[model samples]
Target: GEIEFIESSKDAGFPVINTPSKTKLEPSVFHQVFEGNKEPAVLRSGDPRLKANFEEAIFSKYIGNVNTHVDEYMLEAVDHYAGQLATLDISTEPMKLEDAVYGTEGLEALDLTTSAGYPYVALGIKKRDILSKKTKDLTKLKECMDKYGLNLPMVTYVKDELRSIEKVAKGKSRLIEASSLNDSVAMRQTFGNLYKTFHLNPGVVTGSAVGCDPDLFWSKIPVMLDGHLIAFDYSGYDASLSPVWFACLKMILEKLGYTHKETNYIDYLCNSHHLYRDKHYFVRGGMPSGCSGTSIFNSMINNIIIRTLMLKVYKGIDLDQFRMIAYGDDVIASYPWPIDASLLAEAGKGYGLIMTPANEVTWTNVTFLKRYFRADEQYPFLVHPVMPMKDIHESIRWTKDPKNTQDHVRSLCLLAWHNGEHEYEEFIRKIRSVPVGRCLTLPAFSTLRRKWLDSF
Candidate 1:
């Protein structure tokens, strides 16, 4: 049976250990408090106006419905446990890309830019030709496309879309007049760019372009590969994929004869900024944090580059056990057990990426059904409370004002009801010991109060 142990605090009486019990007890006053009921005692003592406002505000937005029996709470707990177990099972398996596709037929009718006949200028390949001796050939490029299940038609469409985007990039005015805009503004800028070029949301275009949908990609990937996967987080991930690095990405893709575009659009997006204190401030490397296409675009490039590396450079590496998922700058993947961070770093460097150490657990923690779950059951998992502790304490203190003694008694009673009997008695003893001027007392109970007392 699961148990909860609350640590002792200076203000609290003793440590509380609540274990699952076979014998069920009826719901008490504590249960009413949990359900957002303002008892009469709390109502009568405080500032009549403040008390009225508190009841109206707090009681109006209730948490959960009142539970009649202890078994009801246990049932909810069991349901939660079942959900957690199902999540754990899902994390161990590889996710299918096709199954993750979302419905976008409605989006097609929105008159957005489609990848039909747009010319995709391979900026990375063009740069590579100028900077390095390694140039891509058509045959190698075709083979790469086929291996990735990409057709020439799809490639052509994406290229055309890129061309349209480039035209906008070259036309937009690059002047900083604003003081400082936050991330939300950056996101809006990206969305605005999407509407300007494609007349559609980034999700509709990027999902159709890539076989895997970005929104569902993270969940589909196996969180753990044979009980071990390197959690890789890039420092300034979006900002770091610079023009040169982005070009390197295109250069790698061009080897398969696919001309990928949007280098100028991404460059423009990353460089565009506002003036703060008469100085222009731009995101350092790649896209801004709030850009809609950031995750999809990065994941698309990351998958292609990593897959290409595995085929060409790391030929001896077994791929059957290999599984990886990247959401924005964070990447989780199974690598050779004898972890060689340098190997990953060097490979990333060749593709214009910097691979740094990342916190494994942080990246692996999955949020499902509003609960935070650990990939491995050994780690601590938490079911966040519906009501925050800060809010709870605020309500408790609201009733404690010296002028609102009547309401204060009600508040104290409510708190006592929520706390264990031993804890409640100790609280009462402390309040009684206070000097007459500072002492607070519990008010007499009404019919409803008698009912709660009997239940408790």
Candidate 2:
């Protein structure tokens, strides 16, 4: 009888139930879960608190620390750049200011250490030397660009976008303490202009740079190839390479009107940090994650340059076979045939980027355009629901206000039921079985109960 009721409804689709306003579980589907089950089951499951503990254990046991390796490809890329610089008659000069500030005495005072023990003195010296050389080279490159009349692009920040971000931040802060610089507004404005400039650069020069239009890669390029697509990710990408090649990132501050002193201050902050358990670690390559400009700058200089290099190396290769989209350090490419992993590794090496061996995947069962979508062999043409439990809980919380009408609660519950059939059923079952649900009787919930009974 329950099966007949569910099969009769148009809304009773597989997994996800689509509604006019929102996705939900069909009323018939709920009836199937609750029918011949008036009494609540004693083994109450799906309690939010219990679920949290289970998730924590799952993460700790299955997703612990990820071991990282040296990026040999990145080292090769450094050599490649070094050779290119030699042709241009550019020399890497040492950092006089850095040497003066972080001399032997200053290094000792920081009390830096690694898991192995105290930080190697030679490594510290090497990091500073590389930093100095890179800064000098970047300065020279900027001068060369000025002489050649090459200029970066720029963009304007509208009020509406800022308001949207502010709202998102507020909503996020309600769940967790908002972790952002106190002067986030000013930082965003500064980064926005810089982001637009890099992305808007002319022709192939800026074609590799991404940020403003990450979607363009998916929308403009052919996504399906040989019935398979490839998603490649770089592990510890930010920490893999030495920062000695980031000319574009250094150029941003001056281009955006930051004074010499201010630029130096920013650099100092990025390079300086303490490791966990009382060890101070000096960053050699990547910008700190907390910096507002880190994502945009890294995308422009590292990812873009690597992509440009990849195109150049495979110049004579069939262009139709290669369609790619890169956002930050993640690259998704479609190919007409199986790709040679070695070729990609070589290309990444040229730009000081490393491709992780395990992070690469062939998209035979899943499609990754904007988000991950898995294929369903059972209903090849139907839209299946893969709603996460977290979303359903959040929806319930959204409609929990006393001022909300019964319709609001019903709509959200139905939507949740549609997205998550098993989870929603368990959630409701737990609520009914527990004393907490019996003690709290809201007007909206009372209406839900009446309607729920009437449906059967």
Candidate 3:
């Protein structure tokens, strides 16, 4: 079942790329999709090769077209999530960007069709967008992974060995076989169990983040071989055994009973979900990148991958010796002091993971989830308060309501305070004209400053 880049079976309106499923649709062209100002315009691919590159990068059907099938694909994810919820009896929540975080009020949603409203695109990158810094580095990391992982030859041998293990285990012992998603319940339970277990022996893993901003790999530097994985999409941000793990996701979806045919169409539609900007469709990881449960689904795939990595590399080592921490696409692992850096890097490559350069140390300071840790520091980890210098210091809109201005200054003060920007402390004290250390002690600021810890 090769995907044919056929159009609407002879098509209409602005052209849309379609799959064998008839899932492809006609989409109206627009420059500004969400519309502060709208460009109702024509559609054209920046380069003809984008079509072929799309074919190579995308496993999904339909390009940049919206339809019920889109909703259907997402609904299945939600139901699976609902199943996980009813199954786990758990619930959900987000921390917005600082500017998006305004005062005297709040923000957010769980909309399902929000996924439906936005259609996924299947298009690849041209090198200019990647190599030329002037344009958005739209495919900098993406193209890197494309040439690095998609074409790399290490996949089959590793995949075959794992499957060999799978077959051998199948031949010898019979544990228990239920329906597709049964063990996922066990997986769900073990998620908490493992974290609790890991935290119990926190010394095995040093928590991490890059210096200045922990959310950075954006400023991807060459350092300790340990770092988060790049090219995060739905499945196999890079994994040879991705199919093995992805197949597990399929069973849960199967219980919902979509034929593999439709589910795959749905899956491909989701996987091909990329970016459309400046009249070019840049290659992206799967899913709308904005939807919920993606974290859950991707986390499950990550769990299988990391667990297998341990099996492949760290097996039988004391659990207390080598360990790792995972939060979505970010993985911080500790290799045994006895381990060689290149060997782990070698192992990761076969899995489609591109790691940061090696660090030659006993592995002290680390950062993950925007919090930094000094392996030998008494206070250990320090929080990263974002220093939005230009934004906060830019032209003052003090002409807005005094309450509004006060709130803006208040949020700015907290960021400034945590960052030790005393200049800003004085700046706000003067410019915003709020009280200085007095407000720092008062209830509105007092009950709040510590409450500001949530910015982490």
Candidate 4:
């Protein structure tokens, strides 16, 4: 009965955030998640005790040793840039900074990671040397860090043993403090909230380098929300009731096949041979085509119902040993426990189908039957299974951009965070014609031209 009330699916459109306005627009789900709502589960933000427990749990798990090296200078530069980024207000207009950092022509020349940009391209050029964990280039990384003016202090952490040593480092030791661990989880959760924010309120592209890169978020947005329960809450009533419908179909099919046993007639009645031949009796719903979100659910329900009803009719057949697989209308039923396979196949063919190569069918006393599906011809389009986001490809390229050398410098600083100290010298040595002193003044700009001109 619950299944009969099932309805079709519909979209919830965009999400909404809380504002001091009164209109017919959707209400804010964000506050309700932190506050109480009709939904049974809501994350309470007001409870201080719950918050403290959650914070402690995060620090112990996710945040590893804080002393772990990520380039300090690079981090400082990133912090500087991030701070600079925070100051420039772009509430009204979209900032095209990503375009400025990645563009190829004029003053906007930037090398994407995919392009032949410095540092990135250089990394690819010297991949074998760097990834092999032997020779590394940290000088180049330093140059990049200088250009970006990144901040690294926030990333520095102490190893577990070092945390217990004679002198604990001043300020917060970089080891996973309980608070830092909480922050990391919160950051990920914040990203999810951002996704919801964007979904609910689509804004125009604005800000320098900021809104220019839609590809970054566009690729991530759907993959993050698909099939999530939060997204389910937004679905209309019909979509919500589909699962309930499937459950009802199961109960009704069972009720239809009530009969008595302990008589020879029961064996004759239970034999799938008779039920299989009767096309009109077993037919439930229209057969589906192939695998899809919709078709898969339908096909599974129909096949399961038919199998149950058939078992009720056949008395001698061991229901446990009998197995069936239905792909669309193509059914493969296997029976063990001394039933003739040809007889079963013959009965199946009468129901709007044909028995394939009857001689190939085998039946014997076994626990269960296994059936295989083979096709004489292959579908042309079904070459390889694709991922859900197959249409999307990562456009971020790590390349060398001589024109925008600052990005090149930034890349090195980011890398040094992982293999910083060890590879620092080689990157510095690769300065080629440029001097190390210029790095302090010019930041991350390549002084190769200055060096070559001076030699002249």
Number of the top candidate by lDDT?
2
Better of 1 and 4 by TM-score: 1
Q: Give the range of the ten consecutive residues with the poorest summed lDDT in model 1.
A: 153-162
Which ranking of candidates, highest lDDT first? 2, 1, 3, 4
- The candidate that wins on TM-score is 3
Model 2 residue 300 CA deviation (Å) reads 3.1
TM-score of 1: 0.32
lDDT of 2 by residue, 13-113 (tens): 21221112221222222223232211111111132223233222211211111223324333443343333223332112222323322222212111112
RMSD of 4: 32.0
Off by over 4 Å in 3: 1-108, 111-245, 248-288, 318-323, 333-342, 357-365, 370-416, 421-456
Q: Over the stretch 165-230, how does candidate 1's per-residue lDDT look in tens digits? A: 222222211111121112222223323332222222222112112233322232233333333555
TM-score of 2: 0.38
The TM-score between candidate 3 and the true structure equals 0.39
lDDT of 4: 0.24
Per-residue lDDT for 248-313 in model 3, tens only? 445544443434652352243233312222111322223322222334455444444444444456
lDDT of 3 at 153: 9
Compare candidates 2 and 4 on lDDT and give the better one.
2
Total clashing residue pairs per candidate? 15, 8, 9, 60
C-alpha RMSD by candidate, in order: 26.1, 21.4, 19.0, 32.0
Candidate 4 or 2, higher TM-score: 2
Give the lDDT of residue 299 in candidate 3: 48
lDDT, model 2: 0.35
